Amino acid sequence: SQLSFHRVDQKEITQLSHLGQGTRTNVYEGRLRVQELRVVLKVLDPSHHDIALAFYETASLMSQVSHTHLAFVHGVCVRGPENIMVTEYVEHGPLDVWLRRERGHVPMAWKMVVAQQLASALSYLENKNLVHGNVCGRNILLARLGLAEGTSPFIKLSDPGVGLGALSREERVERIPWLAPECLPSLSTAMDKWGFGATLLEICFDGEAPLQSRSPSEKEHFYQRQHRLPEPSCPQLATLTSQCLTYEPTQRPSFRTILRDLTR
Numbered sequence: 001s002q003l004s005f006h007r008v009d010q011k012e013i014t015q016l017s018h019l020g021q022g023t024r025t026n027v028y029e030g031r032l033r034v035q036e037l038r039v040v041l042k043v044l045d046p047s048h049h050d051i052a053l054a055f056y057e058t059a060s061l062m063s064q065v066s067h068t069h070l071a072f073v074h075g076v077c078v079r080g081p082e083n084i085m086v087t088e089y090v091e092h093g094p095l096d097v098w099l100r101r102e103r104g105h106v107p108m109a110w111k112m113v114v115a116q117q118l119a120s121a122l123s124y125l126e127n128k129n130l131v132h133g134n135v136c137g138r139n140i141l142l143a144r145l146g147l148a149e150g151t152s153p154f155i156k157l158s159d160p161g162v163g164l165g166a167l168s169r170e171e172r173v174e175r176i177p178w179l180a181p182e183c184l185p186s187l188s189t190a191m192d193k194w195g196f197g198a199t200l201l202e203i204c205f206d207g208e209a210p211l212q213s214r215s216p217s218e219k220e221h222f223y224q225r226q227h228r229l230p231e232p233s234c235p236q237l238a239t240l241t242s243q244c245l246t247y248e249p250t251q252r253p254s255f256r257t258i259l260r261d262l263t264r
Protein backbone atom coordinates (compact mmCIF):
# COMPACT_ATOMS: atom_id res chain seq x y z
CA SER A 1 0.00 0.00 0.00
CA GLN A 2 2.88 2.44 0.94
CA LEU A 3 5.03 1.60 -2.20
CA SER A 4 5.25 2.93 -5.80
CA PHE A 5 7.44 1.56 -8.66
CA HIS A 6 7.01 0.46 -12.33
CA ARG A 7 6.23 -3.27 -12.93
CA VAL A 8 8.54 -4.48 -15.79
CA ASP A 9 7.18 -7.30 -18.03
CA GLN A 10 9.64 -10.28 -18.33
CA LYS A 11 9.26 -10.07 -22.19
CA GLU A 12 10.85 -6.54 -22.03
CA ILE A 13 14.18 -7.74 -20.47
CA THR A 14 17.15 -9.82 -21.72
CA GLN A 15 19.75 -11.18 -19.25
CA LEU A 16 23.38 -11.07 -20.53
CA SER A 17 26.64 -11.61 -18.56
CA HIS A 18 27.00 -11.96 -14.77
CA LEU A 19 28.75 -8.89 -13.23
CA GLY A 20 28.85 -9.91 -9.53
CA GLN A 21 26.92 -10.40 -6.28
CA GLY A 22 25.19 -7.92 -3.95
CA THR A 23 23.47 -8.65 -0.61
CA ARG A 24 21.08 -11.57 -1.49
CA THR A 25 21.42 -10.63 -5.25
CA ASN A 26 23.18 -11.55 -8.52
CA VAL A 27 23.80 -8.62 -10.92
CA TYR A 28 23.71 -9.10 -14.76
CA GLU A 29 24.18 -6.82 -17.73
CA GLY A 30 20.80 -6.69 -19.51
CA ARG A 31 18.63 -4.98 -22.13
CA LEU A 32 15.31 -3.21 -21.42
CA ARG A 33 12.97 -2.72 -24.44
CA VAL A 34 11.03 0.61 -24.08
CA GLN A 35 14.72 1.23 -28.22
CA GLU A 36 16.88 -1.44 -26.43
CA LEU A 37 18.46 0.24 -23.35
CA ARG A 38 21.57 -1.23 -21.63
CA VAL A 39 20.64 -1.87 -17.93
CA VAL A 40 21.66 -4.07 -14.97
CA LEU A 41 19.35 -6.77 -13.65
CA LYS A 42 19.55 -7.45 -9.90
CA VAL A 43 18.10 -10.97 -9.35
CA LEU A 44 16.95 -11.57 -5.76
CA ASP A 45 17.95 -14.90 -4.12
CA PRO A 46 15.09 -17.26 -3.24
CA SER A 47 13.82 -15.27 -0.23
CA HIS A 48 11.26 -15.02 2.61
CA HIS A 49 8.37 -12.52 1.86
CA ASP A 50 10.01 -9.97 4.28
CA ILE A 51 13.24 -9.83 2.15
CA ALA A 52 11.17 -9.51 -1.08
CA LEU A 53 9.24 -6.63 0.66
CA ALA A 54 12.51 -4.89 1.69
CA PHE A 55 13.60 -5.23 -2.02
CA TYR A 56 10.32 -3.60 -3.22
CA GLU A 57 10.79 -0.85 -0.55
CA THR A 58 14.21 0.03 -2.10
CA ALA A 59 12.64 0.05 -5.64
CA SER A 60 9.93 2.40 -4.24
CA LEU A 61 12.49 4.77 -2.58
CA MET A 62 14.70 5.01 -5.68
CA SER A 63 11.67 5.41 -8.08
CA GLN A 64 10.44 8.59 -6.26
CA VAL A 65 13.84 10.41 -5.96
CA SER A 66 15.89 12.19 -8.72
CA HIS A 67 19.48 13.49 -8.49
CA THR A 68 22.27 13.57 -11.11
CA HIS A 69 24.48 11.54 -8.65
CA LEU A 70 21.79 8.90 -7.88
CA ALA A 71 21.48 5.85 -10.20
CA PHE A 72 18.08 5.38 -11.98
CA VAL A 73 15.76 2.45 -11.10
CA HIS A 74 13.55 1.40 -14.10
CA GLY A 75 11.34 -0.93 -12.05
CA VAL A 76 10.85 -4.51 -10.83
CA CYS A 77 10.15 -7.64 -12.88
CA VAL A 78 8.30 -10.47 -11.01
CA ARG A 79 8.43 -14.06 -12.45
CA GLY A 80 6.32 -15.91 -9.78
CA PRO A 81 8.74 -16.40 -6.83
CA GLU A 82 11.57 -14.58 -8.75
CA ASN A 83 12.17 -10.78 -8.32
CA ILE A 84 14.44 -8.67 -10.59
CA MET A 85 15.23 -4.98 -9.99
CA VAL A 86 16.07 -3.21 -13.28
CA THR A 87 18.60 -0.40 -12.65
CA GLU A 88 21.03 1.96 -14.49
CA TYR A 89 24.12 0.41 -16.10
CA VAL A 90 26.99 2.72 -15.15
CA GLU A 91 29.90 2.44 -17.61
CA HIS A 92 33.04 1.89 -15.43
CA GLY A 93 31.39 -0.08 -12.56
CA PRO A 94 31.95 0.01 -8.76
CA LEU A 95 34.47 2.54 -7.39
CA ASP A 96 36.05 0.24 -4.73
CA VAL A 97 37.09 -2.29 -7.44
CA TRP A 98 38.17 0.55 -9.79
CA LEU A 99 40.38 2.24 -7.12
CA ARG A 100 42.10 -1.06 -6.14
CA ARG A 101 42.89 -1.68 -9.85
CA GLU A 102 44.09 1.97 -10.44
CA ARG A 103 46.07 2.12 -7.09
CA GLY A 104 49.01 4.59 -7.42
CA HIS A 105 47.66 6.92 -10.17
CA VAL A 106 44.41 8.36 -8.73
CA PRO A 107 45.27 11.93 -7.62
CA MET A 108 43.76 13.61 -4.49
CA ALA A 109 41.99 16.29 -6.66
CA TRP A 110 40.07 13.48 -8.46
CA LYS A 111 39.10 11.92 -5.10
CA MET A 112 37.85 15.36 -3.85
CA VAL A 113 35.50 15.69 -6.89
CA VAL A 114 34.08 12.21 -6.13
CA ALA A 115 33.58 13.15 -2.43
CA GLN A 116 31.80 16.42 -3.52
CA GLN A 117 29.46 14.49 -5.91
CA LEU A 118 28.61 11.88 -3.27
CA ALA A 119 28.03 14.71 -0.74
CA SER A 120 25.61 16.47 -3.23
CA ALA A 121 23.63 13.16 -3.59
CA LEU A 122 23.49 12.73 0.24
CA SER A 123 22.62 16.50 0.76
CA TYR A 124 19.56 15.86 -1.50
CA LEU A 125 18.48 12.72 0.50
CA GLU A 126 19.07 14.56 3.85
CA ASN A 127 16.78 17.39 2.62
CA LYS A 128 14.17 14.73 1.62
CA ASN A 129 14.64 13.01 5.06
CA LEU A 130 15.19 9.66 3.19
CA VAL A 131 17.80 7.10 4.33
CA HIS A 132 20.01 5.29 1.75
CA GLY A 133 21.56 3.12 4.51
CA ASN A 134 24.29 1.41 2.37
CA VAL A 135 26.80 4.18 1.46
CA CYS A 136 30.06 2.42 0.50
CA GLY A 137 32.62 2.35 -2.34
CA ARG A 138 30.89 -0.71 -3.88
CA ASN A 139 27.66 1.31 -4.32
CA ILE A 140 29.45 4.27 -5.97
CA LEU A 141 29.39 3.64 -9.75
CA LEU A 142 31.81 5.48 -12.05
CA ALA A 143 30.01 6.95 -15.15
CA ARG A 144 33.07 8.99 -16.37
CA LEU A 145 36.76 8.16 -15.67
CA GLY A 146 38.00 11.80 -15.41
CA LEU A 147 41.76 10.84 -15.51
CA ALA A 148 42.51 12.34 -19.01
CA GLU A 149 43.80 15.99 -19.02
CA GLY A 150 40.84 18.47 -18.97
CA THR A 151 38.29 15.81 -17.74
CA SER A 152 36.62 15.17 -14.34
CA PRO A 153 35.02 12.01 -12.95
CA PHE A 154 31.22 11.52 -12.62
CA ILE A 155 29.65 9.07 -10.09
CA LYS A 156 26.16 7.59 -9.49
CA LEU A 157 25.27 6.19 -6.04
CA SER A 158 23.58 2.76 -6.56
CA ASP A 159 20.25 1.77 -5.02
CA PRO A 160 21.10 0.40 -1.52
CA GLY A 161 19.66 -3.07 -2.40
CA VAL A 162 17.74 -5.07 0.24
CA GLY A 163 16.92 -2.63 3.11
CA LEU A 164 19.29 -2.82 6.12
CA GLY A 165 16.22 -3.26 8.38
CA ALA A 166 15.61 -6.75 6.87
CA LEU A 167 19.22 -8.10 7.09
CA SER A 168 20.70 -10.48 9.76
CA ARG A 169 23.01 -9.20 12.56
CA GLU A 170 25.75 -11.31 10.79
CA GLU A 171 25.26 -9.23 7.60
CA ARG A 172 25.26 -5.93 9.57
CA VAL A 173 28.60 -6.94 11.25
CA GLU A 174 30.04 -7.74 7.75
CA ARG A 175 29.23 -4.08 6.74
CA ILE A 176 31.46 -2.62 9.52
CA PRO A 177 32.92 -0.03 9.17
CA TRP A 178 30.34 1.45 6.67
CA LEU A 179 27.52 0.39 9.10
CA ALA A 180 26.63 3.21 11.55
CA PRO A 181 27.28 1.92 15.13
CA GLU A 182 23.62 2.65 16.18
CA CYS A 183 22.57 0.16 13.40
CA LEU A 184 24.41 -2.83 15.00
CA PRO A 185 21.80 -3.81 17.72
CA SER A 186 18.34 3.87 14.36
CA LEU A 187 16.85 4.37 10.78
CA SER A 188 17.77 8.10 10.59
CA THR A 189 19.64 10.01 7.83
CA ALA A 190 22.39 10.30 10.53
CA MET A 191 23.53 6.74 9.51
CA ASP A 192 24.45 8.05 5.98
CA LYS A 193 26.82 10.65 7.61
CA TRP A 194 28.75 7.71 9.14
CA GLY A 195 28.63 5.72 5.85
CA PHE A 196 29.89 8.85 4.02
CA GLY A 197 32.79 9.16 6.51
CA ALA A 198 33.69 5.43 6.07
CA THR A 199 33.45 5.78 2.26
CA LEU A 200 35.82 8.85 2.27
CA LEU A 201 38.38 6.71 4.21
CA GLU A 202 37.83 3.87 1.68
CA ILE A 203 38.42 6.34 -1.23
CA CYS A 204 41.52 7.89 0.47
CA PHE A 205 42.98 4.34 1.01
CA ASP A 206 42.41 3.41 -2.70
CA GLY A 207 39.48 0.99 -2.13
CA GLU A 208 41.03 -0.74 0.93
CA ALA A 209 38.58 -0.09 3.85
CA PRO A 210 39.72 -0.04 7.52
CA LEU A 211 38.76 -3.20 9.59
CA GLN A 212 37.97 -5.25 6.38
CA SER A 213 40.71 -7.83 7.35
CA ARG A 214 39.23 -8.38 10.88
CA SER A 215 36.90 -11.25 12.00
CA PRO A 216 33.23 -10.54 12.88
CA SER A 217 33.99 -10.76 16.69
CA GLU A 218 36.81 -8.15 16.31
CA LYS A 219 34.66 -5.82 14.08
CA GLU A 220 31.83 -5.95 16.69
CA HIS A 221 34.33 -5.37 19.61
CA PHE A 222 35.74 -2.28 17.75
CA TYR A 223 32.22 -0.69 17.88
CA GLN A 224 31.41 -1.94 21.44
CA ARG A 225 34.71 -0.31 22.64
CA GLN A 226 34.00 2.88 20.59
CA HIS A 227 37.50 2.60 19.02
CA ARG A 228 38.15 5.53 16.59
CA LEU A 229 38.75 4.66 12.90
CA PRO A 230 42.05 5.88 11.37
CA GLU A 231 42.39 9.54 10.22
CA PRO A 232 43.82 10.13 6.71
CA SER A 233 47.23 11.97 6.72
CA CYS A 234 45.56 15.09 5.15
CA PRO A 235 44.48 16.86 8.39
CA GLN A 236 41.69 19.05 6.80
CA LEU A 237 40.10 15.77 5.52
CA ALA A 238 40.78 14.01 8.89
CA THR A 239 38.70 16.68 10.75
CA LEU A 240 35.78 15.91 8.37
CA THR A 241 36.09 12.06 8.41
CA SER A 242 36.37 12.16 12.27
CA GLN A 243 33.24 14.37 12.65
CA CYS A 244 31.27 11.98 10.33
CA LEU A 245 32.64 8.91 12.21
CA THR A 246 31.33 10.15 15.61
CA TYR A 247 29.55 7.36 17.60
CA GLU A 248 26.82 9.77 18.86
CA PRO A 249 24.63 10.24 15.72
CA THR A 250 23.33 13.74 16.76
CA GLN A 251 27.00 15.05 16.80
CA ARG A 252 27.65 14.22 13.07
CA PRO A 253 27.67 17.37 10.87
CA SER A 254 24.92 18.30 8.35
CA PHE A 255 25.64 17.76 4.60
CA ARG A 256 25.52 21.61 4.46
CA THR A 257 28.65 21.64 6.72
CA ILE A 258 30.17 18.63 4.86
CA LEU A 259 29.71 20.28 1.40
CA ARG A 260 30.99 23.66 2.71
CA ASP A 261 34.13 21.92 4.12
CA LEU A 262 34.75 19.87 0.87
CA THR A 263 34.40 22.99 -1.41
CA ARG A 264 37.64 24.75 -0.14
Ligand SMILES: CNc1cc(Nc2cccn(-c3ccccn3)c2=O)nc2c(C(=O)N[C@@H]3CC[C@H]3OC)cnn12
Binds near residue numbers: 020022138
Ligand atom coordinates in the same frame (compact mmCIF):
# COMPACT_ATOMS: atom_id res chain seq x y z
C1 LIG B 1 29.75 -1.93 -15.76
N1 LIG B 1 28.45 -1.71 -15.03
C2 LIG B 1 28.23 -2.20 -13.80
C3 LIG B 1 29.05 -3.20 -13.25
C4 LIG B 1 28.80 -3.68 -11.98
N2 LIG B 1 29.68 -4.63 -11.52
C5 LIG B 1 29.63 -5.26 -10.32
C6 LIG B 1 28.47 -5.44 -9.54
C7 LIG B 1 28.55 -6.13 -8.32
C8 LIG B 1 29.77 -6.64 -7.90
N3 LIG B 1 30.92 -6.49 -8.68
C9 LIG B 1 32.07 -7.06 -8.23
C10 LIG B 1 32.51 -8.27 -8.78
C11 LIG B 1 33.68 -8.89 -8.34
C12 LIG B 1 34.43 -8.30 -7.33
C13 LIG B 1 33.99 -7.11 -6.79
N4 LIG B 1 32.80 -6.49 -7.25
C14 LIG B 1 30.86 -5.83 -9.88
O1 LIG B 1 31.89 -5.70 -10.56
N5 LIG B 1 27.72 -3.19 -11.30
C15 LIG B 1 26.92 -2.24 -11.82
C16 LIG B 1 25.81 -1.61 -11.35
C17 LIG B 1 25.27 -1.72 -10.09
O2 LIG B 1 24.29 -1.04 -9.70
N6 LIG B 1 26.06 -2.41 -9.20
C18 LIG B 1 25.78 -2.42 -7.75
C19 LIG B 1 27.09 -2.35 -6.96
C20 LIG B 1 26.44 -3.31 -5.94
C21 LIG B 1 25.63 -3.78 -7.15
O3 LIG B 1 24.25 -4.05 -6.76
C22 LIG B 1 24.24 -5.16 -5.85
C23 LIG B 1 25.43 -0.73 -12.31
N7 LIG B 1 26.27 -0.83 -13.38
N8 LIG B 1 27.20 -1.77 -13.07
